[PDB]
Amino acid sequence: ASLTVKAYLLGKEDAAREIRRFSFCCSPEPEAEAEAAAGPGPCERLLSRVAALFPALRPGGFQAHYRDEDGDLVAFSSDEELTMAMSYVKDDIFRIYIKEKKEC
Amino acid sequence: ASLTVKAYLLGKEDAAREIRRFSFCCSPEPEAEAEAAAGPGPCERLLSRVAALFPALRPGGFQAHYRDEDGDLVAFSSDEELTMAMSYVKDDIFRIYIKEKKEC
Amino acid sequence: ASLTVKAYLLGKEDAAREIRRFSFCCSPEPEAEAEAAAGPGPCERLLSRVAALFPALRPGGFQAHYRDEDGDLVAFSSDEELTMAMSYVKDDIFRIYIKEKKEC
Amino acid sequence: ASLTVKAYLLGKEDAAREIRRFSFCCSPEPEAEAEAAAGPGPCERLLSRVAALFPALRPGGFQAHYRDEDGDLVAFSSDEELTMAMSYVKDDIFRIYIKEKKEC
Amino acid sequence: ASLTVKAYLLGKEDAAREIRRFSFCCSPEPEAEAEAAAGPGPCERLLSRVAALFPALRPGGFQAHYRDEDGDLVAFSSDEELTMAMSYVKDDIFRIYIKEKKEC
Amino acid sequence: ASLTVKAYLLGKEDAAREIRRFSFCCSPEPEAEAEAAAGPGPCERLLSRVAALFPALRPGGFQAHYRDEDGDLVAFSSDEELTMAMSYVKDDIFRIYIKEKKEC
Amino acid sequence: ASLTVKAYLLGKEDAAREIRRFSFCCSPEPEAEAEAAAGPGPCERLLSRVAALFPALRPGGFQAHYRDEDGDLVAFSSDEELTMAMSYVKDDIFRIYIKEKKEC
Amino acid sequence: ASLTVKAYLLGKEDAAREIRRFSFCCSPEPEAEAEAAAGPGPCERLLSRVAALFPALRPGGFQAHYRDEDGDLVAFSSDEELTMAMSYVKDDIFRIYIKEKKEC
Amino acid sequence: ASLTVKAYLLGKEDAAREIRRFSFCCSPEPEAEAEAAAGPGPCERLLSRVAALFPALRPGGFQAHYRDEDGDLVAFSSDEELTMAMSYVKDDIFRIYIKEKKEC
Amino acid sequence: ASLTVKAYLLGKEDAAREIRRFSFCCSPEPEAEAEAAAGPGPCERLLSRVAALFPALRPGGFQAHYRDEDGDLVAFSSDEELTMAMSYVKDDIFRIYIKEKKEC
């Protein structure tokens, strides 16, 4: 399941500041034997890869979102919630919206 | 009864700060024998799951609401009152509105 | 459980004089056999590490605090009370507030 | 009945000098058979635990209070009076106010 | 694989200020023996050549982009992402869009 | 790992008095054999080089800082803490903030 | 390497008081045999020539600066730091900013 | 599945001439045994009920529509197409748009 | 590959007369054994389904189109040309434009 | 060299009557050994494929054109002239204009 993720980085008034467009492999998985318990999570691997590409942000300091049917930026941080996020993929493009974690 | 809960987290002037959109299983229930008295309550399981998802709040320190026909944010904390809250579900989306418990 | 501790050292009017930001390993533990009774405590290892980093203070002469929901600097010195202190961690940052032990 | 007690230690002009925030188990009770007459009292177990945590005070030399509806620091020392003290719990936080027993 | 790169330098309101049009040799590579580990990267050689031509910018202080199918300026800085950038070449012209790295 | 350090020297109201901008080689290391135990530390080599450049300060009499995500000047003096300082590098610029050690 | 240096002399509120615009020969060097150890330094020859032109200042009593990408007046006094200063030359104009050394 | 149908009857320039607002029971179904093959269809029962309410139209002489995401009046006459029509229900209101079948 | 086809039926001045919006299963295929040579074609199954839904047209007497990047109604009748038609799908909606085959 | 050909079929007043948009493989060629002299020509394979797609025309009875820089429909029938036709490809779209061969 080759899945393209188009990571929007949002700015001041929720206008996009930098777009990245990488590829992601959620349903694919490594070798079918346990070298660990079971890897990282599918949302933990996503946020580890969004943090690796953008130079403007550091890992652990950003909140990834998506747009639902109402147009609202629904956040996601879990991997049982990333599966609800990915039911909104249009063609193969999973558009996420990155916002940084400021003061309050 | 698969039931989607869209948890709005309200901010300063009751504008939404973070939206979460999980799923909830009120009328479904576990195995039909008593390993306890009867579990937690259906409102106790809801507020335990809203607190588990949001990183911005800690359990016991938030008040969950809903909108009635007048547009008012009616609070709910009981499980005989959660049944009156859930008579306002529109399609299958049970929109709650989270507010934190500050000074006074 | 990698846990970041941001140690504020408070000054005259409870304004921060020096901030340190180390990492702490409370729930992790050494080898699963007894070379002693059971190590030091998880609060004894914390206050031994806060005293090791700051040159401005000496061990046994400082009181570590935290902020609760009311904004008050609740002190902690026990390890059954450090577990109540650590239920206020926000992302992974456990902010403590150090005050020195003066005359009276 | 898990019950959180936030022990304020009052100072010179009834300003708080040290806050402790422990947990207390009034309505819970041990094994349902008599190894004694009936334990200590529920107020005797409270004041034995407030004295155990604070290093700044010694047992038998402090007066625990609470705030009533008038804002007054009503003292309590009995266990038929601790039950009237605990009808002022707000969420699960039972705020007591400790004052030491000086000269006159 | 002779590949023409038309480097647009963007200005204030994303209007082009200076255009350069050089040639680039991504899939071609030097002698088939290791004088190093493996050269620079194919994106590192691109950004080293864009910085060499423009006198108006200095290396390390510019962000190269491209236009995707939506018309958005998708940035690229990696060499596993330059391969996704170069799937949008039209005839042999790989149009990149240079933006400088200002304050915030 | 070529790493640029931009040393701000702070003044009266934490306004910068002199900026220096040198280069630093933390992860690079000398010849792979022991002429000593293991050199100086990576934080000891940093503070020895900040003291060598500025004529306005003398070695052993300055405290180097950095800004975390909260905007606070977190100090660092150790080399297990310099590794946490250097997880805030933005492009390749590691901005430190120098303050001198006065009376009290 | 003919290199033009435009020496701004800054005044009260960092406004330019006198501009000089001379030429400088950093990478060029004299006869390829040692009449000395190796001349003066390339920063020592620069500050000896800035002091020779301006009548308003005397040698040893001025601090030469440059502007980095942030707009800050980064000072330089070394000749391993003048090489980092000269990576900001725009066409062939190396703009330095002179400030005199007053009381404190 | 109680489902409200708001039947707009369109006029000359696609302006609504009469609105009816009845209720419909698509996913509900009668007794679970075959008194026939399987009833009428779920679209045949809908158009039989729209024709029963409006006095201004006669059955077999009207075309029921719906609005898609583009704002276009997409017609439907089948019951495998009514299931695509009913994926646009907003709260529980299924707005259809009735147009009569004139000359050409 | 669930693929939605929105069939516009064009009228006199290429204005839409009736819209249908069905679903189509191009890349999906039946059981992996040959009961025939290989079914109908993927364009033959499309035009057999567009003719089945619209009552206003009869099979063999309509020309299906699509819009390319120039805005022109490019026709398609082959199944090696339907694969070029379907590279213009936007989200999952494959908009075709039906025109009937009149005199000349 | 994948090359898209957009075949316009011109009508009465040189307005397009049917557009086809196929793909063409001019510079690609079959197996590198002679089963014939050398295939058909690259213009003979083009006009054999334009005649295969359009049902409205028969092979040998149409004249293929292209637009030059003056906007004129320059015809081509040779394969040393098709190479001059294909120097006007814009992105990868080689727009030809088909006209039928009538009386005079």
Residue numbers in the entry:
A (entry chain A), B (entry chain A), C (entry chain B), D (entry chain B), E (entry chain A), F (entry chain B), ...: 2 to 105
Task: Copy text verbatim from the article accompanying this structure deposition.
PB1 domains are protein interaction modules with critical roles in the assembly of protein complexes involved in autophagy, signaling, cell division, and redox processes, as well as the auxin-response pathway in plants. PB1 domains form homotypic interactions via conserved electrostatic motifs molded by basic or acidic surface patches on opposite faces of their ubiquitin-like β-grasp fold. While type A and type B PB1 domains can form heterodimeric protein complexes, type AB members can mediate interactions with either PB1 domain type or engage in homotypic interactions to form homo-oligomers or hetero-oligomers. Our cryo-EM structures of filamentous p62 and AtNBR1–PB1 assemblies revealed that the presence of a tandem arginine sequence in the basic motif of type AB interfaces is required to stabilize a polymeric assembly.
Image classification of segmented PB1 helices revealed that both AtNBR1–PB1 and p62-PB1 polymerize in two different tubular morphologies: a projection class with a ladder-like pattern, we term L-type, and a projection class with a serpent-like one, we term S-type. Further analysis revealed that the occurrence of L-type or S-type assemblies is persistent along the individual helices in micrographs of AtNBR1–PB1, whereas for p62-PB1 filaments regularly displayed transitions from L-type to S-type symmetry. In the latter S-type, one of the three helical rungs is propagating in an antiparallel orientation, related to the central rung by local dihedral symmetry. The L-type here has a pitch of 135.9 Å with 14.16 subunits/turn, and S-type has a pitch of 138.6 Å with 13.60 subunits/turn. Using the derived symmetries, we determined the 3.5/3.9- (L-type, p62/AtNBR1) and 4.0/4.4 Å- (S-type, p62/AtNBR1) resolution structures. All four structures form tubules of ~120 Å and 150-Å width with an inner diameter of 45 Å and 70 Å for AtNBR1–PB1 and p62-PB1, respectively.
